[PDB]
Amino acid sequence: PPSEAEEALIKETRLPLTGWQQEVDQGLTYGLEAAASIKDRSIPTFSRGELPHYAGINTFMKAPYLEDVREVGKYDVAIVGVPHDSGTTYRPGTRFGPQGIRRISALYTPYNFEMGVDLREQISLCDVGDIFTIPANNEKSFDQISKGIAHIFSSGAFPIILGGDHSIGFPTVRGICRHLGDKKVGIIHFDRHVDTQETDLDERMHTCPWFHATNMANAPAKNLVQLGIGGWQVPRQGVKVCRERATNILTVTDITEMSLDAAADFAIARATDGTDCVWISFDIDCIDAGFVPGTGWPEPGGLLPREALYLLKRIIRETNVCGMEVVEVSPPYDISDMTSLMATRVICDTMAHLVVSGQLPRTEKPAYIHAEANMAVD
Amino acid sequence: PPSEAEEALIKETRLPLTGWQQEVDQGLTYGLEAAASIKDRSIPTFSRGELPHYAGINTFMKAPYLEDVREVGKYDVAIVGVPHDSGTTYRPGTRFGPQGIRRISALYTPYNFEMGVDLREQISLCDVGDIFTIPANNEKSFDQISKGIAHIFSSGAFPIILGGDHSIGFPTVRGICRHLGDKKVGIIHFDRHVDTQETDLDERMHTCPWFHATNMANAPAKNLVQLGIGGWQVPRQGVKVCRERATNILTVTDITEMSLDAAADFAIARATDGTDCVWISFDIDCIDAGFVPGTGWPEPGGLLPREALYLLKRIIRETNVCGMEVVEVSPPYDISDMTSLMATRVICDTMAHLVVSGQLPRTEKPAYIHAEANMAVD
Amino acid sequence: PPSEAEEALIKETRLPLTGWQQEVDQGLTYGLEAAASIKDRSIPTFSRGELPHYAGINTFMKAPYLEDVREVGKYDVAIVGVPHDSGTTYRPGTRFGPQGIRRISALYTPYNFEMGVDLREQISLCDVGDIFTIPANNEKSFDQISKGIAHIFSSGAFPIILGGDHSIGFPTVRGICRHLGDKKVGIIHFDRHVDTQETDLDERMHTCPWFHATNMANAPAKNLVQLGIGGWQVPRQGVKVCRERATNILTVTDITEMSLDAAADFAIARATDGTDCVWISFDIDCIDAGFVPGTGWPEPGGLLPREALYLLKRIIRETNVCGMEVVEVSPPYDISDMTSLMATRVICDTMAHLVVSGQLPRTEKPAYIHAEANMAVD
Ligand SMILES: C[As](C)(=O)[O-]
Ligand SMILES: C[As](C)(=O)[O-]
Ligand SMILES: C[As](C)(=O)[O-]
Ligand SMILES: [Cl-]
Ligand SMILES: [Cl-]
Ligand code: NI
Ligand code: NI
Ligand code: NI
């Protein structure tokens, strides 16, 4: 049987280079041809595109910036930043999450070796910039986030959210549900913390989004799957709510003891039972603190990177995913963007899994996307 | 007599707000109107422009990104990054100078209080991104730098260069000189180090730019003015060239003892005697090391910030400036972008002085700008 | 069966103390006897040797500095720094790799518990300092590196290279091949990235060493083994070359799925099939990013430290090793020398494996070392 590396060499031969050539040609047109001493004539004078990695304006993966967000429906994937840390109960700083993730994402090429995916060749990706968050008023910021996510989601572009603390899980899912009609969404929640209590410090903070998300008809608590719960920061009020609403929880010990495949099976079966799509909400602190120091609620004994990445491989490829957020990256507490890099890897792997499973590019808008907004979902 | 504060309050009333309103209107068009709960209806859903400062894609001061650099002649000022550290003889890292400067420049408004300047109302500014530098070949990187700066300069846009180590002083000035025809450029060089030796570690490094710049006819060494020379890092080979070529040098003690006004008088008279424009090359390490830890060659006993900024006030307002570079910011060695912030202040102050002295916007392209490039200037 | 701890207790009794005593006597002669209040009369007034760990001039493991590099043939092992980061395509700073490794290596004793090796008793080790690298000209720096490694290698001393970015893989191996005559060297390459493309940013950078090494007759691509390839930074151009030249690749998943012993078996069989010795090129970024933040190309999902160290145990002990380099340690991005410490552990473990397997000390110069330099190998 062939090794993963042998398949990767074969898969790479199947990838085109038209996307790369178009980047080269645009670069030479917009950035001039290189000086006479440069041998490689694909190089421009001015950096325009991927190279050099240390150079250029820092959109996510140096994807095109989409200034006119009304055109977002023309893209397969829209990276959207949510610079929001008004829901943080310990360290703030994740309002800079989007910046840190964009910054370190310059390290990446659009090509994933193991999967034989090249995003520059296989999807159209844009970076729409950031939601205009409201730091002094969590609820107004919620309303901004929901309006923007509902905009991107209803356009048909697949939304990838750069958080931002996890309180945004309520307004993002609320934005989705405004266009779900009567369809239901299962939430697959990677986290050490249940995030299901009603209020915290008298407000709807990052410990609270799934209390309020699953108050919506379109988001059944019975379809909330919570992978990695454990430690000394799981609030007892949230635990009570999980028990009363019958959410589906696995601890890190559960996951490693039952095997990753059985853990993903559990999540796939529970999240899709009676729903039409799945929302992926990935808290970067579900990874062991030694890998993600740049976060508000680090906890030892979390998932190791390859464990979380393998769970995503199983779950993304075998569910109908309608969107994703990666939350709680807090650059001011990071070292050399280690934590932003972990988040970037989750984001890019997810896109690659959507491509491998044929979910992107979409050949038509999904059945669950309703055009008219249901402004009273919450 | 009126205080600077009293004058500042009056100067502000003279500034328009059409540039601000135009930004607001573009923002609402491209970024949608805000959600219903937001009272201030100049706020969009998606950040598009200055606000929020912590959000958005990080161009310089969040200025417009000019993807098509062939259109650069339509702007009064073009910010261009030169992510180049193949000339560093101690610490590398200033290839990230442009990124660090861009990142912390989100902190600034276009408005300077003391000077009554608002760059959003009074000039057109763009960020053209970065030169495609060549880390493994300093001379090829020179050729890229010269071609790109010559493009911007000859278009009529005023170039501001984000370094990048100071070796780029040779190719930047070489790019200007390709279009100076029979005109001369005086160099006003803020630095602890003379940067005038022939080679270092067998190449034309950041200790060498003015040896090779002043080999060109268009850039007389007798018009090189070097402000702040001193310390334990001034190489004896460079000192020999300064003496043999009769450059104009003031130490920090010279400057503080003769007074800042006399120091600027000295610089203005020597740089312009027989020249038609002046090039400002500002090494961030001319500031005392305690203010600029993010640099390759820190040195105690440098200029204090208000001293360097006052010199710029005098020199920029009273010379015909053709461009500026701010070099040697090295973010990997910085703390909370302290050094990038110092560089940003120099950049923005310079723009404001160009506006106060009526050098920008230009009512016509300057006499010294020739259309045809003289590829044999060096 | 006896536990590893029990064997370690027995192995320690087999180690001599002549090397320790000689250090003590030199220290007292050169550093004076201690003040009268010091009970332990093996302590000098001036630190001379291992102790104290926090004190002293920072050679590697506080080994002797060999000022006269012409005498290197008298030592079993020569540590040589290659402070070269002109091949870096994202973050620079690994020109300080040798300094970072030297600094944190003060923490180590010459003695390894599990293996019962004491390098102070069983080999002669020197630190010859650094190659005079050329930051502004990658190719000149290559020529310096090749000349120096060729000097050490042909002397009979076992070369251990402290990088320095991985572009040095070409000039280091080229230096070896200048003295291999008609013998072949298999390359065992620990890395997430293939490093096999022809040029990058128009030059022979750290993505390119094995394209050019395996152009040499003495270094067959068919004997290149690449352990750990994967992620989003493997360039498609390099993947092409691996496929066309039939290099031998295992991904991280391959390695963990087939077992470490089977992966080492695979590496041993492929690298030694038709070669006379093996070159170890260890990119520190093959370790998961959470352990090596101080590097230019971190990538999540890499090898865990005990996995990489066990592979080295199997590979070093069962191949005829002619030298080793550990590359891409970049101290400016490190935290408390965590990454330099990992590199030091790889280096010291390797020496212990060479001693355990009887490869060091050498009782005679190896058959593959030819005295005359073959300056046209490339
Ligand atoms: C949003 As949380 C309380 O899991 O850091
Ligand atoms: C460019 As310098 C030698 O003054 O840091
Ligand atoms: C030498 As590399 C491109 O694997 O850091
Ligand atoms: Cl940034
Ligand atoms: Cl040190
Ligand atoms: Ni959470
Ligand atoms: Ni959490
Ligand atoms: Ni200087």
Ligand code: NI
């Ligand atoms: Ni300088």
Ligand code: NI
């Ligand atoms: Ni690597």
Ligand code: NI
């Ligand atoms: Ni490598």
